[PDB]
């Protein structure tokens, strides 16, 4: 069923912000494992022929016996597939969302400050998200590989704050990693995901 | 009130099992942060002059306004204080508990298998525990910095499977880390904690 998407750039395309060793491991091992376990959980079930977005949006309906496996690895598959596409070696802070951000938060900087506090505050493994909730933009975080789509909020930007995403280059300094992320945001993709809600 | 406990050995004393850079960061930053934040949550209160074990044990009646900070950072302070004392550069597979394990699981290698499978199955950030409950041994894992003492079960052995504990040396290879752990278990301390429940 599901497959591991190829990266849209080289492992080292995001240095010096995200290190090449991490990009390789993160994608080829961690993501891939999410795919393997996800396929095992869904094979033989109604979920097999569903899209990853459809599975995660309707995770509350998934049978109790495979719900955790799908929640965690389906989560994993969706979240990382989004993540790779939301990164870019030549981020431009412009476009539809940067403008909606500017209008809602006053500055792009004010927005980053709020995103960074919430992302740093996520205790344990999780993700920080910019989501649209019924037309309105808001910053939420989730534990582990949970995704706001499960609660009917469309994510348009996400940062992975599992320690495996930053430890090799940043060790404990998660605030420095979040700071480096801004330089590699794929705002074009962010736009594409926002405009898909309209 | 609370203080960062000193390590009973050198930063490099557990090599080649747990690397020295990890031990230093793990102890000086990660554990220290749990201590700083716990101190902020309990200062000027009842809890300040209590022992970390009794705080964590009676977390369920700690007022809802500081519960999360105590749970996370107190739990953090407890779990790591146990962890450092539960490790040794002079590890020796004998004693009261080894014998009980032998009796209950059949062998050490059987008990290790079940411990290693559960430790590897803990999704996200967490700990794997050997606990005394109802005068029997039981393997359980907990999320984040939760400790089975809160659910009335006395832990006697504990393994940190937060990615910070192993990423620098093992990266994604959590099983290899669990494998190395066996070589530095301080079973003299496990005996002491087990015998304290009698
Ligand atoms: Mn990840
Ligand atoms: Mn730890």
């Amino acid at each position: 069923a599901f497959e591991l998407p190829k990266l849209p750039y080289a492992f080292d395309a995001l240095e010096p912000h995200f290190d090449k060793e991490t990009m390789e491991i993160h994608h080829d091992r961690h993501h891939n494992t999410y795919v393997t376990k996800l396929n095992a959980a869904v094979e033989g079930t109604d979920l097999e022929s569903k899209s990853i977005e459809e599975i995660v949006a309707n995770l509350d309906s998934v049978p109790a016996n495979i719900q955790t496996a799908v929640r965690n690895n389906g989560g994993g598959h969706l979240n990382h597939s989004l993540f790779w596409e939301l990164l870019s070696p030549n981020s431009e802070e412009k476009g539809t969302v940067v403008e909606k951000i500017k209008e809602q938060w006053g500055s792009l900087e004010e927005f980053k400050k709020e995103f960074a506090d919430k992302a740093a505050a996520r205790f344990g493994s999780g993700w920080a998200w910019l989501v649209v909730n019924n037309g309105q933009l808001e910053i939420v975080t989730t534990p582990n590989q949970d995704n706001p789509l499960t609660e009917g909020k469309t994510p348009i930007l996400g940062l992975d704050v599992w320690e495996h995403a930053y430890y090799l280059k940043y060790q404990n300094k998660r605030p420095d990693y979040i700071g480096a992320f801004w330089n590699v945001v794929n705002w074009e993709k962010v736009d594409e995901l926002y405009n898909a809600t309209k």
Side-chain angles (χ1 to χ4, degrees), chain A:
Chain A
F2 297 97
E3 259 161 24
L4 185 69
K6 287 195 283 277
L7 283 191
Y9 35 73
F11 291 133
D12 69 340
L14 316 182
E15 303 212 329
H17 310 294
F18 294 177
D19 52 302
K20 74 189 197 288
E21 294 75 16
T22 295
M23 295 295 307
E24 185 168 17
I25 284 158
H26 204 179
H27 173 264
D28 291 14
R29 289 164 174 110
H30 285 281
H31 193 186
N32 198 48
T33 292
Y34 297 133
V35 177
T36 300
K37 292 210 197 287
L38 176 60
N39 288 325
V42 304
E43 175 171 41
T45 82
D46 257 30
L47 315 164
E48 219 169 345
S49 69
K50 300 208 177 86
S51 83
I52 192 60
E53 294 82 0
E54 188 175 355
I55 291 163
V56 173
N58 290 288
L59 193 64
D60 301 313
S61 303
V62 169
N65 79 289
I66 54 155
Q67 215 204 88
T68 300
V70 170
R71 170 175 188 186
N72 295 342
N73 294 288
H77 179 38
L78 179 55
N79 295 353
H80 294 76
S81 302
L82 287 175
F83 197 51
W84 314 132
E85 294 287 322
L86 282 166
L87 298 175
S88 172
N90 44 35
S91 176
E92 285 196 288
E93 288 172 339
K94 71 194 281 163
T96 319
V97 181
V98 162
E99 293 314 301
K100 302 256 149 67
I101 281 171
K102 273 163 160 162
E103 288 179 316
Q104 186 152 313
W105 272 274
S107 50
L108 192 59
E109 202 64 65
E110 186 73 359
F111 161 82
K112 290 173 178 190
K113 210 191 161 203
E114 206 196 294
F115 191 92
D117 296 1
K118 291 175 186 197
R122 163 52 60 175
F123 192 77
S125 297
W127 290 74
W129 301 104
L130 175 60
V131 310
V132 55
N133 196 11
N134 307 328
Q136 221 70 19
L137 298 171
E138 53 174 83
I139 297 172
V140 287
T141 81
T142 50
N144 303 328
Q145 304 294 353
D146 292 24
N147 187 293
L149 208 52
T150 300
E151 315 203 326
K153 312 184 170 91
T154 310
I156 68 182
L157 187 55
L159 177 56
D160 188 3
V161 297
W162 286 63
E163 287 170 326
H164 65 236
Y166 63 85
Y167 218 75
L168 290 173
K169 190 175 159 89
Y170 299 102
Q171 296 80 58
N172 61 297
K173 299 193 306 308
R174 195 198 280 183
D176 290 353
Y177 163 72
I178 298 156
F181 172 64
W182 304 121
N183 298 278
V184 297
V185 171
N186 190 357
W187 289 108
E188 212 160 57
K189 178 65 174 171
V190 173
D191 287 5
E192 184 204 277
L193 301 173
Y194 178 73
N195 290 339
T197 68
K198 297 174 164 292

